[PDB]
Write a protein that binds this ligand. Structure first.
Ligand code: HEM
Ligand code: NAG
Ligand code: NAG
Ligand code: NAG
Ligand code: NAG
Ligand code: NAG
Ligand code: C14
Ligand code: CL
Ligand code: MG
Length: 325
């Protein structure tokens, strides 16, 4: 379907309401590396089995959290292009599943959001790097580090100051321990934005003060659960304040080169000075590598979802056409 538009009414309101109760997982229910989508599935803003259409995801992040429309469109269609089934229009918010339908031919993976190196990547705050065996489940040791950083830099709350320090710590931990650490292009951008999301979207909208308490943080990150009486943010937003996180410890895009402590800058990578390059490489390299020579029906679905992706791209970038117009 067409990408949903912005909310008609973006006021703060109770989103942990009678129509959207938290429920535990049933056998087969999928949760993944994103605490936002996980919480929306566990409150029935998304299908509770964790398999959704792009339009369901965009409507859920707007209605449940007041995620802004352009951000919702960009992230949802990026995820769907690399991890979703373009013919059935279904995406898993976690593991690969037969529930997204018959797979396209290799080298397309349709691996769900758990697929490493498409959307998901290294130096996550509460999830381990894929090299360590699990890129999707809540990790208590990593969450306790988030609590420690909140105690040291946030007066016991998670805020953008904490985000700036923790983002850098996770990068340094990956450089020191993950010989395959990758921090370029799409992951370089999204890794910084994601650290603002708890301060911008997990804070009760009646306060909207950017100070996330650790009880609320655990409820979202571990249990995919809104606090009792949770109000969504009082206006549409996503990554506002990402400039604070970058400014704390400015990094160049790069990777470990098959050994720990070998972080090598990639001059072919996009960085925050070249946001349009990040979009162009995502389409021309990442998407194209999954679908190098698609059949007629796949080509049509790709071009449709690429048009939708471009709706989410900041004004001033040129649309690219890997399969023609
Ligand atoms: C709009 C569509 C969305 C998509 C497709 C999406 C997808 C993802 C994916 C794949 C990751 C894992 C990246 C990684 O850490 O390796 C992630 C991380 C994250 N997402 Fe989402 N997300 C979306 C919206 C949101 C929303 C609305 C929120 C909050 C309300 C949110 C909060 C987060 C947070 C906090 C993380 C980082 C988790 C961590 O590092 O421990 N996301 N998202
Ligand atoms: C929008 O929603 C808020 C809170 O639910 C309500 O108080 C406000 O009056 C509504 N605006 C419109 C469109 O009625
Ligand atoms: C290692 O890095 C490459 C890309 O540089 C990626 O294809 C691969 O999945 C990574 N594997 C793990 C488990 O990190
Ligand atoms: C959690 O992360 C820690 C720290 O990186 C790691 O040592 C541990 O194996 C991870 N897994 C679990 C299940 O705690
Ligand atoms: C984070 O909280 C600490 C303690 O209250 C404070 O020093 C710092 O200014 C806060 N940062 C933000 C961005 O609010
Ligand atoms: C992407 O491909 C288009 C041609 O379809 C080209 O104009 C553009 O320069 C390419 N961008 C990159 C970064 O490769
Ligand atoms: C890439 C993730 C950043 C956080 C989301 C907010 C920005 C809205 C998406 C626009 C992307 C533009 C790329 C050129
Ligand atoms: Cl919006
Ligand atoms: Mg990750």
């Amino acid at each position: 379907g067409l990408p949903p538009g912005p909310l008609e009414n973006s006021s703060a309101k109770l989103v942990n309401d009678e129509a959207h109760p938290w429920k535990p997982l049933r056998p087969g229910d999928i949760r993944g590396p994103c605490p936002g989508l996980n919480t929306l599935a566990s409150h029935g803003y998304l299908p509770r089995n964790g398999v959704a259409t792009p339009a369901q995801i965009i409507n859920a992040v707007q209605e449940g959290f007041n995620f802004d429309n352009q951000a919702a469109i960009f992230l949802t269609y990026a995820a769907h292009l690399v991890d979703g089934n373009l013919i059935t229009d279904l995406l898993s918010i976690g593991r690969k599943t037969r529930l997204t339908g018959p797979d396209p031919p290799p080298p397309a993976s349709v691996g769900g959001l758990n697929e490493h190196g498409t959307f998901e990547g290294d130096a996550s705050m509460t999830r381990g790097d894929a090299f360590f065996g699990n890129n999707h489940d809540f990790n208590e040791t990593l969450f306790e580090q988030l609590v420690d950083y909140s105690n040291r830099f946030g007066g016991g709350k998670y805020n953008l100051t904490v985000a700036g320090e923790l983002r850098f710590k996770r990068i340094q931990d990956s450089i020191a321990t993950n010989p395959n650490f990758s921090f370029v292009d799409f992951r370089f951008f999204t890794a910084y934005g994601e650290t603002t999301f708890p301060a911008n979207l997990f804070v009760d909208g009646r306060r909207d003060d950017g100070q996330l308490d650790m009880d609320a943080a655990r409820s979202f990150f571990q249990f995919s659960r809104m606090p009792d009486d949770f109000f969504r943010a009082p206006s549409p937003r996503s990554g506002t304040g990402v400039e604070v996180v970058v400014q704390a410890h400015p990094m160049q895009p790069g990777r470990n080169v098959g050994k720990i402590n070998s972080y090598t800058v990639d001059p072919t990578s996009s960085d925050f000075s070249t946001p349009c390059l990040m979009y162009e490489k995502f389409v021309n390299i990442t998407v194209k590598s999954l679908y190098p020579n698609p059949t007629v029906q796949l080509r049509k679905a790709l071009n449709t979802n690429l048009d939708f992706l471009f709706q989410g791209v900041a004004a001033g970038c040129t649309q690219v056409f890997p399969y023609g117009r």
